[PDB]
């Protein structure tokens, strides 16, 4: 019980962090696509 609850909470935390990171790297893709050829 506690093992499953704890693991779920840990997963949820890393999913939050990674969601933020994916937004940031999508900004990165936008900016780098601008600089790719202009």
């Amino acid at each position: 019980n506690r093992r499953l609850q704890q693991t779920q909470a840990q997963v949820d935390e890393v999913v939050d962090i990674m969601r933020v990171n994916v937004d940031k790297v999508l900004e990165r893709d936008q900016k780098l696509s601008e600089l790719d050829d202009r």
Binding site: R3, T7, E13, K24, R28, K31, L35, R38
Partner: protein
Amino acid sequence: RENEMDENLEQVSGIIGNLRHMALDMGNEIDTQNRQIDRIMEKADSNKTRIDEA
């Protein structure tokens, strides 16, 4: 029959901890490089307008 299952849950928990700190590291690096790329775009536009004027 159910001990193996909680052992797997234990391993998964540890790896999740490592994935947490990996995600933090790559977040910080993406931030720094993001504003570095901002600087690069500022300098590129500077060369672009300074060429465009003459």
